[PDB]
């Protein structure tokens, strides 16, 4: 279908744009990334970062996942992200998203060789 690394690509990194612009950023995303498609995916963060920067959060500092997997690492620095959060009326297929652009550290699971990130696990 899509690799684990191509997934991770398309639905996480937006790399063209330094921040999110407006409030109508991730309703567009969402539906540009085909995150929308079968249903309103409710949380999304995207990252505004070059891709050798992310892949490189995986040679940095270990961390448990959400799910007590230890292949997680979180980003020694911060990074510029967009949180979408789906809203309390949405509804699918008429998806609507809460933006949220700030600046934290990232955590993602990564596996393979080369060892890349494969899942986005939280901002922090
Ligand atoms: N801060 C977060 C938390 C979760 N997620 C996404 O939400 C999906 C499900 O997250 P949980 O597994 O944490 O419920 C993940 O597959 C990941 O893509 C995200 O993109 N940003």
Redesign the pocket.
């Given at each position: 279908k899509e690799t684990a690394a191509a997934k991770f690509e398309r639905?996480?990194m937006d790399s063209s744009t330094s921040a999110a612009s407006s409030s109508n950023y991730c309703n567009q995303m969402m539906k540009s990334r085909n995150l929308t498609k079968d249903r309103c995916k409710p949380?999304?963060?995207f990252v505004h970062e070059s891709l050798a920067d992310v892949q490189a959060v995986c040679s940095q500092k270990n961390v448990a996942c959400?799910n007590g997997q230890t292949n997680c690492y979180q980003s020694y620095s911060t990074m510029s992200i967009t949180?979408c959060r789906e809203t309390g009326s949405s509804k699918y297929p008429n998806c609507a998203y809460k933006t949220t652009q700030a600046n934290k550290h990232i955590i993602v699971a990564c596996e393979g060789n080369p060892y890349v990130p494969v899942?986005?696990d939280?901002?922090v």
């Amino acid at each position: 279908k899509e690799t684990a690394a191509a997934k991770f690509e398309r639905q996480h990194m937006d790399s063209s744009t330094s921040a999110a612009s407006s409030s109508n950023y991730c309703n567009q995303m969402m539906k540009s990334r085909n995150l929308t498609k079968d249903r309103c995916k409710p949380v999304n963060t995207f990252v505004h970062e070059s891709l050798a920067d992310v892949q490189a959060v995986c040679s940095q500092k270990n961390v448990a996942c959400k799910n007590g997997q230890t292949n997680c690492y979180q980003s020694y620095s911060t990074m510029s992200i967009t949180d979408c959060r789906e809203t309390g009326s949405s509804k699918y297929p008429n998806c609507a998203y809460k933006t949220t652009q700030a600046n934290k550290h990232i955590i993602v699971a990564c596996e393979g060789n080369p060892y890349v990130p494969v899942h986005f696990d939280a901002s922090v």
